[PDB]
Design a binder for this molecule. Sequence first.
Ligand code: NAD
Ligand code: NAD
Ligand code: NAD
Ligand code: NAD
Ligand code: RM4
Ligand code: RM4
Ligand code: RM4
Ligand code: RM4
Ligand code: RM4
Ligand code: RM4
Ligand code: RM4
Ligand code: RM4
Lengths: 256, 256, 256, 256
Amino acid sequence: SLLIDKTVIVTGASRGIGRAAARECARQGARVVIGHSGSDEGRAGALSLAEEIAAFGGTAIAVGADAADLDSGEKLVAAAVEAFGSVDVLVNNAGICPFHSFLDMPRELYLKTVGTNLNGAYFTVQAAARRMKEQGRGGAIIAVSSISALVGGAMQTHYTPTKAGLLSLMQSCAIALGPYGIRCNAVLPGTIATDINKEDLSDLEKRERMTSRVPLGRLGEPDDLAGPIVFLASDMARYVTGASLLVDGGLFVNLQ
Amino acid sequence: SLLIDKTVIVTGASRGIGRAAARECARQGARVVIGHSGSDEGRAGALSLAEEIAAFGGTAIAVGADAADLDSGEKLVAAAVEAFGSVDVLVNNAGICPFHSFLDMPRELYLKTVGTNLNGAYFTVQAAARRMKEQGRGGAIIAVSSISALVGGAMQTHYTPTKAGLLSLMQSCAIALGPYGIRCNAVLPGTIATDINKEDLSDLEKRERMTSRVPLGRLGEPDDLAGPIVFLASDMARYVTGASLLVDGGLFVNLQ
Amino acid sequence: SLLIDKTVIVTGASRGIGRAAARECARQGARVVIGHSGSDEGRAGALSLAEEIAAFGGTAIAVGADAADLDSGEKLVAAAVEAFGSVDVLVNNAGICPFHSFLDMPRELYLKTVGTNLNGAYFTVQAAARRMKEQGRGGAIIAVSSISALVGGAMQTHYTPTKAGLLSLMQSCAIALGPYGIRCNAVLPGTIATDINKEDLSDLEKRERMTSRVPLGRLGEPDDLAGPIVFLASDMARYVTGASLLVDGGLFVNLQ
Amino acid sequence: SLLIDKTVIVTGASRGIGRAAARECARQGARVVIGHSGSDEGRAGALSLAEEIAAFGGTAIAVGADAADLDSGEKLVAAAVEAFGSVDVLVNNAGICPFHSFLDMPRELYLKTVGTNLNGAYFTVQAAARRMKEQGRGGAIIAVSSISALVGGAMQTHYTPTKAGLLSLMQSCAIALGPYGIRCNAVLPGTIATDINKEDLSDLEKRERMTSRVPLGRLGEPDDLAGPIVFLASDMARYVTGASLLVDGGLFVNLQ
Ligand SMILES: NC(=O)c1ccc[n+]([C@@H]2O[C@H](COP(=O)([O-])OP(=O)(O)OC[C@H]3O[C@@H](n4cnc5c(N)ncnc54)[C@H](O)[C@@H]3O)[C@@H](O)[C@H]2O)c1
Ligand SMILES: NC(=O)c1ccc[n+]([C@@H]2O[C@H](COP(=O)([O-])OP(=O)(O)OC[C@H]3O[C@@H](n4cnc5c(N)ncnc54)[C@H](O)[C@@H]3O)[C@@H](O)[C@H]2O)c1
Ligand SMILES: NC(=O)c1ccc[n+]([C@@H]2O[C@H](COP(=O)([O-])OP(=O)(O)OC[C@H]3O[C@@H](n4cnc5c(N)ncnc54)[C@H](O)[C@@H]3O)[C@@H](O)[C@H]2O)c1
Ligand SMILES: NC(=O)c1ccc[n+]([C@@H]2O[C@H](COP(=O)([O-])OP(=O)(O)OC[C@H]3O[C@@H](n4cnc5c(N)ncnc54)[C@H](O)[C@@H]3O)[C@@H](O)[C@H]2O)c1
Ligand SMILES: C[C@@H]1O[C@H](O)[C@H](O)[C@H](O)[C@H]1O
Ligand SMILES: C[C@@H]1O[C@H](O)[C@H](O)[C@H](O)[C@H]1O
Ligand SMILES: C[C@@H]1O[C@H](O)[C@H](O)[C@H](O)[C@H]1O
Ligand SMILES: C[C@@H]1O[C@H](O)[C@H](O)[C@H](O)[C@H]1O
Ligand SMILES: C[C@@H]1O[C@H](O)[C@H](O)[C@H](O)[C@H]1O
Ligand SMILES: C[C@@H]1O[C@H](O)[C@H](O)[C@H](O)[C@H]1O
Ligand SMILES: C[C@@H]1O[C@H](O)[C@H](O)[C@H](O)[C@H]1O
Ligand SMILES: C[C@@H]1O[C@H](O)[C@H](O)[C@H](O)[C@H]1O
């Protein structure tokens, strides 16, 4: 019960890493605000997670909030306060990676990736931190960045800057919000088999090349990110802020 | 003559680091395209630099190009090809840092910082890389990032993500453009006394705190970045791509 | 019970970060091997920790093992197998930092710092990894590195290379041992008020300079590292290997 | 003539990266002290380089100095002062990497790698910096570290800590020696085809895997490191200290 009586907001929590984090936080005692994109599949996934959490004795609510809408942060916080009376943890997880080459990158596709992954995160973090500061009990903010915050991707020239920007946002927010006991950290998943790279890793030569580079011998799954996220949200991480935590089975270090 | 016959574009080169970099590139034999913001001061400063360069026997032109206008990249490249027949080096330097607290950051100021520093850089790099690819001669791209791509700033939560983003962009572009011999690197200046921090360091307590943290015992000046940029643009760096270079007098490493 | 039934070795655990880490590991259900330096104070402190652990219902033993003696690794492992029948976690914590200027560093002091902090750690990791490999159950190795693996210290030119070395050792061991399910990570404490810096921070000007640089507003205490070490040793971190975790209150990121 | 009238010492300069750096520094005007191991091949290679430098109008001398002998630093400095009256640049390049697995790593092989690569470097840097400080004209120190200071190697568990330690030594020495105008930086070669990895890359499956990961499409050669080293030794790098410079053709960043 590492998160008992904490209100946790998770953005883009209908599937993948965010769904697994939302589910494990509820298992750890937290009252979970399941943020979703507002699409048909997003809403359906958030409600089925809320149903699942209800089934094992936890509390959760679903709240639509398009991350590219810079006003959805305050919507999430308002709903969290209505249902649960506080905001104590923000897991900023919503993000997209539409694989695309650099020289013909459309302006709209680039702007949508920065808008969803970084700009919307900035103002979602801003709204949650505002509430945490008003409450005066401290707080915990976790950004789902990437190994690709540290290294490049040829088909991700529009995406890796948003993941690096998210990490840097956590570093700067750690200074700004430290005096209020609000801890700001980034988690950096490696290659996690999810919808975001289902088509990409359908190329079995690329899948094998990537898997061979993982010392632990497997790609990740969403639950691999739940423990790290719960840790960073918990009192186990009471002196951890401004930090980066790679969760990649050793992918980053494996040069030879 | 480290850059003899090369055509170099420098964005935002009317003053500061960009002015010093364009000046030294022309001293090294380059034909320089002095890009500027299109404002009155930017026009005047670009034109006086062109006057100065022609005086000591170089060639240069001044070209207005708002970095926040995502179409200025193709305009700078077109002016470069029209004048000098090639684009061989891009120094992406234009940038703003309007210091501002985090919790009351207005969306317009945030969006202009990301648009100028990161989005405009993306499409300027794209335009210049497209031309370098067509020529078949390789090339060099240098982004002026910052020490603040590695560490935070409480009044720079909107700014440090753009500097981290630029660094990550060089890393991903290094991969996408490597097959075409286009090297992409970031230079990370420390605290350089320029217009961007004139007001900020007018507080003498912060000025001493920052200065006494520099092992070399002084803040930087624009000419301190000219050597490292020329190096990265030159054949001295033929095997350097996807790299970061701190030019900060030791400021980053100095904990105690 | 995050570590229930696991056998944990902590080196240098008579005081400081190691003492707090061994205590919390036993609180989490682990059978702890409290390694110590073999000195009189180290023996006494290890024995009183064993007394305290048995008191609240845990199991532990005290084992003398000079980290600078490169054969103590096999001695710690042998004592662990003899007492508890397995080795499942190694927390390599033993270390010295005799502050000293660079240009007059004596070879004996340099060589003892590298021998204790790095060489002894290498062969302790080797002994413990050999046993984990034989068992076929996986395992976890955590090296106590430092923020000073990322930044410099003028009176620590002999010390920071050992902390950087430990981090790099975890990265390379993560690759070599990944196929055997042994995860290797570094934890990077910031400025933790302990015996190692009691004299150094007795200068109140440096103490304030360091403290005011911590966004969380305080220096750390040994218990601040217990949570992060337990996390890295637990199944919460099943996909974490070859990673670094700053536990520093934001000190690393705080430039301005 | 970036290094005219500077005395440059290069350790382990009989072949590979160090030979190419020694040769290019002499082409840039410097008076070069060609340090070598003192073996038969080391001495023969240093004299043939000195002969080559004589042939194109430069000045150089050969000086035997086993890097694992902690007293050879002062021997190098004494000889540099005798011949050329000053020490102005130190390129610490001597190093070994005897590929070997971790679990059966012999103690002697480990201690020889740390002794040659890190401990000997510490006291060679110490001797050169002592002379530079006495002279009062500033100086430049460059350590040849590695990409493997940033990432792991399964057969390099004994070696990557020495490369990371060298980088960290430069960071700490930058603080300690900054007030004397002595700049301390690390260069990080990627995979450079030399004697150190001739046997390793004779496995063409490993060679192809490594080469495919290089965006620039080739492994390095020694001359690829000469420009970066000359840059860091020159006034072009006047504000560069405590820095790391990757020279790897994009190897590090190329995840996908
Ligand atoms: N899977 C990996 O390998 C990997 C690695 C590193 C980082 N990440 C990051 O993990 C995070 C989650 O991605 P994932 O791997 O679980 O893949 P995913 O596609 O399964 O999940 C993406 C989540 O974000 C939601 N989302 C998308 N756009 C949204 C919007 N405008 N507003 C609100 N929610 C939105 C999605 O509906 C979904 O729930 C992303 O930020 C991604 O950048 C993934
Ligand atoms: N001064 C430092 O300490 C420091 C440190 C690291 C990085 N940087 C970066 O260096 C670069 C140059 O900054 P500086 O220190 O010379 O300050 P500066 O304000 O004196 O120069 C900024 C330049 O960018 C131009 N510019 C601003 N907006 C523009 C726009 N929309 N379009 C085109 N040009 C525009 C400006 O006209 C100016 O010439 C910036 O990107 C900055 O982020 C500065
Ligand atoms: N205190 C900090 O700010 C800080 C920050 C980062 C890393 N560290 C590292 O944390 C670890 C513990 O340091 P601490 O802060 O608790 O200081 P400490 O001096 O109180 O504890 C050091 C422990 O290591 C033991 N030890 C010393 N030499 C030994 C030897 N040859 N053999 C076996 N044990 C030996 C000591 O007996 C002691 O228990 C060290 O490795 C240190 O480098 C400390
Ligand atoms: N080749 C690469 O891929 C690569 C990559 C990164 C870093 N490095 C580093 O580059 C440096 C030079 O290695 P290299 O690639 O040129 O291979 P190399 O084997 O051809 O050169 C090694 C040099 O160091 C000398 N040397 C060895 N032991 C010595 C000793 N005790 N005393 C004095 N000199 C000694 C050698 O005689 C030789 O001149 C090393 O420090 C290496 O760790 C190499
Ligand atoms: C799409 C996804 O993005 C992640 O940040 C990482 O780069 C993974 O490798 C990729 O599969
Ligand atoms: C989802 C769950 O998360 C927990 O932290 C646990 O320790 C495991 O890591 C994982 O199975
Ligand atoms: C505005 C300028 O931005 C730089 O990136 C760095 O943070 C400097 O310290 C600051 O003065
Ligand atoms: C502007 C000029 O740039 C050159 O590279 C030179 O070496 C110096 O660093 C500086 O004065
Ligand atoms: C001795 C101790 O070492 C740590 O690694 C860090 O540098 C702390 O600041 C110092 O107090
Ligand atoms: C020692 C203990 O460790 C636990 O992880 C807990 O969460 C706290 O951080 C600390 O008080
Ligand atoms: C031996 C040599 O060592 C270098 O540091 C690097 O790791 C290269 O890949 C390797 O070939
Ligand atoms: C050895 C020589 O070094 C110089 O700096 C030159 O620019 C090239 O990089 C290389 O051919």
